[PDB]
């Protein structure tokens, strides 16, 4: 038989000739009867074929191929805890996908491997069902059906072969925690065998640091308990009969740094053996050779553990590289920002040896940038001389720009609005700008604030800030409050150390006032100014041009500038006036933000954020009352309303405010509530002491791809603001804030939502105890 025409029935995805080339007999080949049977099976090697019916019409082949080509979908059901993509990964493991050579032969092999995946989760009690369901003309859906009964969880740990160390402390070392009580509720549960291997070394290192240098685990027997959850485990170990680290005989290619190496091998010969201490001490040498240029710090040891005196003797074999490994460096991930601003955010120089710290310290400054997503690097040994290691600084950069809200009259009550936004290095050019301002009937505020943080290459921070507050509090655009204020702030950044940094500047504020309120803290300041207008009216004006002198200093050994987790940065700042200022005073402050890891894996970190401030007159004067200290609302004692926490002044007996309006803005005025009415708003003190203690809380229910830059945190919020210049005779029948004990109280949670134009901090705080004159909005939305 020799075929004149092969009949190729049933072809969708594979070609006709791709079938024909898969045929061992082509149209015109010498055809054998087993080759027809080989035409059956070698067509089945396409994998897209259900049936291949190679018949011949005498010799004329008719090959009725029935097909299982492209699987036109894959569907899932019953996998509540299990991602379908992980199951799709098992399909990717079993070589099947949407649009693939369908194989109904591997259905149970999928479901076994699904269960063997459901094994490797830490279950087995689960149903698995791949259902092959057809799709157009030969295509298919793979429907996946799951009835997940129960996982496996830490139940029991049997340790036999231990001779000293109590398994209760060992489970306390391990992550085999299996107790969350009902009235003593603590911790969590739920076994995984990948934790188990680390839990084996959590035993082992714990024996290694004790002296057990003959410690081995004999065997381990984890119970296949007849319940499809039960994980009991018998481990057999050989305790290790504690040894003494009793001498270091470090040698090798010590590169002439042997004495410095001997400082890293300053040991006690004879104390209980600690190979973990031995382990890190090698890495000190690897840092030491890393310090001295040697990026090949081959430092291996031999703990000659002497079992006759039950001791250890420490051979350490050392090899260094060469010094000048830092040949050049590369910088990557600055497709929108400047390269050289990152390069000047670095400490190791090319044309030098390896300073092992300086790449990291430069990366630490780049970690202290906070305009990044990732701080990492790639440190490529370029092959050649042992002075060729180039360093790709692979880094990723983060979001830019963030508007600040608080705007609104409905956009219907006149032309009145609020702005405010940041520029965030100005697109990575090198100019962080933050600008706000608001023009209403009640104000016209202007502000800009820009830095050239690298005005010179050291980090001279050319921080230019301006303002123009035409604050025009409206009763007739007069008679409530007038103050047009304007001026600048040019303040400069100073290198002090490489984590220490000074600030100093000067200030222009020309306030220009009219129709001034009767409340005493103004007037006690007004009389401290020596200016004594009439307080029964708001007829009173003030023109001042205070020329002050700014100063400050910053510490910097906290991690990040956008998502920190460990360390602190001290923010000392203050102001004082000059001979020539229109008021002689000062104002000093300090603000703290410590990051102390509760969990040192940083799923729980203490965030102690406190605020201090003090300012008074330099003598014969006072600090201005607008420089008094406030809290509440969005502050670190929140759940309040803004400027509600602090001292509370009283209007002097008052009349028309140059016509206080008919029963509006009552200020002991003629139009309602005359003759020593009181101001229950936080007029502020000359002393500030406010704080927030926040605690990093993990979010498990969120896709942690973006919840990793979401920081949810709990707090209590408490604080006191008061005036040391406060009177107890004109606030005798009023809130006295001469006392420091004016302590507010609040508590709650904040939610920093990571949005693509900056994170969004929204917080519900609840004022537990609120002192004199506090006013509250418990639900505050912030940036």
């Amino acid at each position: 038989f020799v075929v004149k025409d092969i009949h190729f029935e049933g072809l969708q995805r594979v070609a006709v000739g791709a079938a024909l080339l898969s045929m061992p007999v082509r149209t015109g080949d010498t055809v054998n009867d087993e080759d027809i049977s080989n035409t059956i099976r070698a067509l089945f090697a396409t994998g897209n074929f259900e049936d291949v019916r190679v018949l011949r019409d005498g010799d004329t082949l008719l090959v009725q191929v029935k097909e299982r080509p492209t699987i036109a979908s894959i569907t899932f059901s019953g996998n509540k805890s299990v991602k379908d993509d992980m199951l799709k990964q098992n399909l990717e493991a079993s070589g099947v996908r949407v649009g693939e050579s369908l194989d109904r032969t591997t259905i149970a092999d999928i479901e076994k491997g699904l269960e063997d995946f459901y094994y490797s989760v830490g279950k087995y009690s689960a149903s698995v069902k791949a259902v092959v369901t057809p799709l157009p003309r030969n295509r298919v859906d793979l429907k996946l059906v799951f009835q997940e009964g129960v996982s496996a969880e830490i139940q029991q740990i049997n340790i036999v072969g231990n001779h000293a160390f109590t398994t209760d402390e060992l489970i306390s070392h391990f992550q085999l925690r299996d107790e969350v009580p009902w009235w003593n509720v603590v911790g969590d549960r739920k076994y995984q065998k990948q934790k188990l291997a680390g839990d084996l070394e959590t035993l082992r290192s714990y024996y290694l640091d004790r002296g057990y240098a003959r410690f081995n685990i004999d065997s381990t027997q984890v119970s296949l308990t007849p319940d499809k959850k039960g994980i009991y485990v018998t481990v057999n170990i050989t305790e290790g009969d504690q040894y003494k680290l009793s001498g270091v005989e470090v040698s090798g290619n010590l590169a002439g740094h042997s004495a410095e190496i001997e400082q890293l091998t300053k040991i006690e010969p004879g104390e209980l053996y600690n190979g973990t201490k031995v382990t890190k001490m090698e890495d000190d040498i690897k840092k030491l050779l890393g310090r001295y240029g040697y990026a090949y710090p081959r430092v291996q040891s031999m703990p000659e553990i002497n079992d006759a005196d039950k001791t250890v003797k420490l051979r350490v074999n050392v090899d260094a590289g060469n010094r000048f490994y830092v040949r050049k460096i590369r910088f990557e991930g600055n497709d929108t920002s400047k390269d050289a601003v990152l390069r000047r955010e670095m400490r190791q120089m090319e044309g030098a040896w390896l300073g092992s710290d300086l790449v990291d310290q430069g990366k630490e400054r780049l970690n202290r940038l906070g305009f990044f997503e990732t701080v990492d690097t790639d440190t490529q040994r370029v092959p050649g001389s042992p002075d060729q290691v180039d360093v790709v600084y692979k880094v990723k950069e983060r979001n830019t720009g963030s508007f600040n809200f608080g705007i609104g009259y409905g956009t219907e009550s006149g032309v009145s609005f609020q702005a405010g936004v940041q520029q965030d290095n100005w697109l990575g050019t090198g100019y962080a700008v933050g600008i706000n301002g608001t023009k209403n009937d009640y104000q016209t505020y202007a502000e800009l604030s820009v830095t050239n943080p690298y005005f010179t290459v050291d980090g001279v921070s050319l921080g230019g800030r301006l303002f123009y507050n035409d604050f025009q509090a409206d009763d007739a655009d007069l008679s409530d409050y007038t103050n047009k204020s304007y001026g600048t702030d040019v303040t400069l950044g100073f290198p002090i150390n490489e984590y220490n940094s000074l600030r100093a500047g000067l200030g222009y504020v020309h306030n220009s006032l009219s129709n001034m309120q009767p409340q005493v803290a103004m007037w006690r300041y007004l009389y401290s100014m020596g200016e004594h207008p009439s307080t029964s009216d708001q007829d009173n004006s003030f023109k001042t041009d205070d020329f002050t002198f700014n100063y400050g200093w910053t510490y910097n050994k906290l991690d990040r500038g956008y998502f920190p987790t460990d360390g602190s940065r001290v923010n000392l700042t203050g102001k004082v006036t000059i001979p020539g200022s229109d008021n002689e005073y000062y104002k000093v402050t300090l603000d703290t933000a410590t990051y102390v890891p509760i969990d040192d894996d940083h799923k729980w970190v203490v965030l102690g954020r406190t605020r201090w401030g003090y300012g008074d007159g330099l003598g014969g004067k006072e600090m201005p009352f607008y420089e008094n200290f406030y809290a509440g609302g969005s502050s670190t004692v929140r759940g309040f309303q803004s400027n509600t926490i602090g001292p509370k002044a009283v209007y002097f007996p008052h009349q028309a405010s140059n016509y206080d309006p008919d029963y509006d803005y009552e200020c002991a005025t003629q139009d309602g509530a005359k003759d020593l009415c009181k101001s229950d708003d936080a007029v502020g003190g000359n002393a500030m002491a406010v704080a927030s203690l926040e605690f990093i809380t993990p979010t498990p229910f969120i896709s942690d791809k973006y919840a990793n830059s979401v920081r949810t945190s709990f707090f209590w919020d408490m604080g006191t603001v008061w005036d040391t210049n406060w009177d107890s005779s004109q606030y005798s029948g009023y809130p006295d804030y001469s006392d420091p004990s004016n302590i507010r109280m609040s508590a709650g949670i904040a939610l920093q939502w990571m949005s693509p134009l900056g994170p969004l901090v929204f917080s519900y705080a609840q004022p537990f105890k609120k002192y004199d004159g506090d006013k509250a909005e418990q639900f505050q939305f912030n940036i």
């Binding site: 050049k328 991930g333 497709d335 929108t336 390269d339 120089m349 090319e350 044309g351 697109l427 290459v457």
Partner: protein, 218 residues
Amino acid sequence: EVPDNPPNEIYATAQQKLQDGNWRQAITQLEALDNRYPFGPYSQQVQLDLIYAYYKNADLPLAQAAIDRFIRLNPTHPNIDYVMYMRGLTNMALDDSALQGFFGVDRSDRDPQHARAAFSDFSKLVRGYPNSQYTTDATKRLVFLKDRLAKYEYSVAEYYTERGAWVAVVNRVEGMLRDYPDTQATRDALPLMENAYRQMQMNAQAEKVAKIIAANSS
């Protein structure tokens, strides 16, 4: 959209939503063209239409995958002259993009990451298709591509001159030297290495560069 239909009905709506400007639909057409029929007769032209639907909808890595797809679907195709140019034209556009261009802010000292990728593909075009209609285009891209890498590498030799790692000056300048002779920025880097030499007391080696400056005065 557009399920297992006539492929030309998928293809007409593909060419229509291309000409509609519904590239996001035309992508979804040309996908559903090849989601059902990746064996269509214009399935390579689908990839030429996909990148056309990708690039006009600004989908450079989706174009770049379709560029890779056009290679993996047809590595012998003559319309790689589009696609290898498009491989550059993705990577020319994939490299840098910001709104600071109206202010004249240069992004040639930004990272030339896909510019280095477009340095390959535009050159792989004018190697692989040295005759194509895209070839006269891509060569002139490579003219600025080495010159974008000039002001990239010029920006750091200045920094090392500001740093004072004078070995790191001459490394960037010799890298500016040993790649592009055609840049004035290297001839402006010409005193810098020479100054770095003069700071390293290689005044004589700098005077070697000073006659190069004398030769590169014109």
